[PDB]
Symmetry: C2
Subunit: 415 residues, 2 copies
């Protein structure tokens, strides 16, 4: 369902054909200067394979930020065109509009084998389907108009390449609209599906999910679905104290208690025993007398519990130790979830040590996947990106996929 999709590295003879590539260019910009060039850098291998493979034109469509169907100086793709010139060694044509009888007239009769970037897709209301007007009121797009926009994209090119995995969860016009015969994943999309398929379709057992973060309540379905696929789970960092008070009536102090989530842990634990999943909650905690880096700290176990005005912010050394046997015996791991407040040096040991083990287990041969933001922020703070099998770029779609969702942008691809 997820790993049998047509990819760019199979498109026999794309020579002399017009290619539309949906890319992810949602980059940090600050006074017209791109603060982080990492996306777009990631786009080159697909742009380049199209170059060396023939290809009359290479049309690039993407979005930046959330402009909500209105034009907006703040979210232009123009500085992205500037950067691409330095990275390709050629002039890049940047057009101020996405669709029209005039833009397909500037693509045609523009240097052969060249790349063209079109202006932000979300400047049109018909990309998403909904907008907000000049005053800040939700506007909905005419159905006639969305249909027209999708027809206009479809006639910009001959072949559609989708290299924007971070939007595949949205059923937007660029995801489900380009109705050409050949619809293939770019290299980025390819690598996303390849690994997610490797861990979700037919993984090699045991299969571990490391979950973490503050709330239990937004990660309900994320847990529910996983308990079907997963062999073992580590629940940690914040959401653990909710599990602890509800299951072991542990004294929690002023630790983050998720009242919405507290209602459902019983349900989760029932499904867990039912699906035969090992659970591994923390067994001990580093606690502090105030939620900041520079506060007094000590250690308590699950049975001693937490003093009445103190709070747990990281797993204790024994829980850390306890995930030596859990991670190292696993032949595939899905992470996504810090094991405490890693942004805070003192209360970071847990997440850092967890990473060291995942790096190690990858070295031992296992397949490892890092999920959303935060966890990736850690992987990138530590500069360990490629000691892990895969770190998913964009947590919109990666969460949804791990959640059990279908992903419209993946289904729109050929086979």
């Amino acid at each position: 369902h997820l790993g049998n999709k047509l990819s760019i590295s199979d498109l026999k003879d794309i020579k002399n054909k017009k290619v539309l590539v949906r890319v992810d260019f949602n980059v940090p910009i600050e006074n017209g200067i791109i603060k982080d060039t990492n996306r777009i850098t990631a786009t080159l291998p697909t742009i380049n394979h199209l170059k060396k493979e023939g290809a009359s034109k290479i049309i690039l469509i993407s979005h930046c930020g959330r402009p909500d169907g209105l034009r907006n100086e703040k979210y232009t793709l123009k500085p992205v065109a500037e950067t691409l010139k330095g990275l390709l060694g050629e002039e890049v044509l940047f057009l101020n509009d996405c669709v029209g009888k005039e833009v397909e007239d500037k693509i045609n009769a523009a240097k052969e084998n060249s790349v063209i970037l079109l202006e932000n897709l979300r400047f049109h209301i018909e990309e998403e389907g909904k907008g907000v007007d000049a005053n800040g009121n939700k506007v909905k797009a005419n159905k006639e108009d969305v249909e027209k926009f999708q027809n206009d994209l479809t006639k910009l090119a001959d072949v559609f390449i989708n290299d924007a995995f971070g939007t595949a969860h949205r059923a937007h016009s660029s995801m489900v609209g380009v109705k050409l015969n050949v619809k293939a994943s770019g290299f980025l999309m390819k690598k996303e599906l390849e690994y997610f398929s490797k861990a979700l379709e037919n993984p090699q057992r045991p299969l571990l999910a490391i979950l973490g973060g503050a709330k239990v309540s937004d990660k309900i379905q994320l847990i529910k679905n996983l308990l079907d696929k997963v062999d073992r789970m580590i629940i940690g960092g914040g959401m653990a104290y909710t599990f602890k008070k509800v299951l072991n009536n542990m004294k929690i102090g002023t630790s983050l208690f998720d009242e919405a989530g507290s209602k459902i842990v019983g349900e989760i634990m029932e499904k867990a025993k039912a699906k035969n999943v090992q659970i591994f909650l923390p067994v001990d905690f580093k606690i502090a007398d105030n939620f900041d880096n520079n506060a007094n700290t000590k250690f308590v176990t699950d049975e001693e519990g937490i003093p009445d005005n103190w709070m747990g912010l990281d797993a204790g050394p024994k829980s850390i130790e306890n995930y030596k046997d859990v991670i190292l015996t696993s032949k595939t791991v899905i992470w996504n979830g810090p094991q405490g407040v890693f942004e805070m040096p003192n209360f970071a040991k847990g997440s850092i040590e967890c990473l060291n083990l995942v790096v190690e287990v990858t070295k031992k041969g296992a397949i490892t996947i890092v999920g959303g933001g935060d966890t990736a922020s850690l992987v990138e703070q530590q500069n360990k990106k490629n000691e892990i099998s895969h770190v998913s770029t964009g947590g919109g779609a990666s969460l949804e996929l791990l959640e059990g969702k279908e992903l419209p942008g993946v289904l729109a691809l050929s086979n």
Copy 2:
């Protein structure tokens, strides 16, 4: 299972007399130059405020959001003009405060008429409400987790009793929805009514329970369709979707009509589950087709067997399919409706959805419980002004969808029992 409804409400709440009550309201309302162009959402909270008022209550502190300011004070989304509207509706003074937490707010709340209504400014001006935001430049910014902690405990300081009358942001776990850690957490009159009808229809419904789904895409409604098939007895799939179903299942010559490439790959899986679960599926059998996606185009009628000629498109259900709604709808004892049966925004292609609506009106009077999932289906009921002829027109976008998709709704879970 079980969690929806059987929750607490203002109704059946003793000991409200002399208490500071924090009410989470839905004031996300259309505005131009400080002039609220539709006050429905505001008048809707009047029962809640009134009952609280009429019960004692030292203070009635209102917290809400307007639009998507993304964690920054932004003038186009200030709640000030609402306070001006509430003054007109309650016939008294209403205190509007620029902040929503902190030292000063708590003091200025305390020194105010001992039965007063106070409106605090847009929650979403604080990054900690949603949890994420965007900075002045346009780049995504994530909130510090200890700042959320302070924000959530600050809102809890504001009052003694919490009342949540903002179904519609129940599907999101924002600070104002799961952060007010007070002993008494109860639903408002609007919330109570949402929770009441959905459980009435999704837990122990009068059978036969009918779902009516419609719209352009089928690729985004997969989770909706799937979760509904294990609780429903009848289902009508209409307008836009229908074609994607008709080409996959009946090999229909479909014309230029809307085809969902993403969705066609799932039609199979759906019909298998529908048969497994013994759910009758109803699909249009004739169509109104045009030679152009435009009102006042050329129109004629064709059966699915005749098929749509090339370069023509189906834009509405045909007369026999419309006629065929009678027996499906009028024999149902409970109806869930989330999707128009055609391009109803064009008079020429609205006969389907309108005639559907009249039949849903007709079965309500026959004693059935009818619910409009709405958004797009809602605006039709509005346009026809028949919002009263239906048991419940859900006043919630994504929260009603995620509930009908079988998800959990943090806002709800966080209420007392």
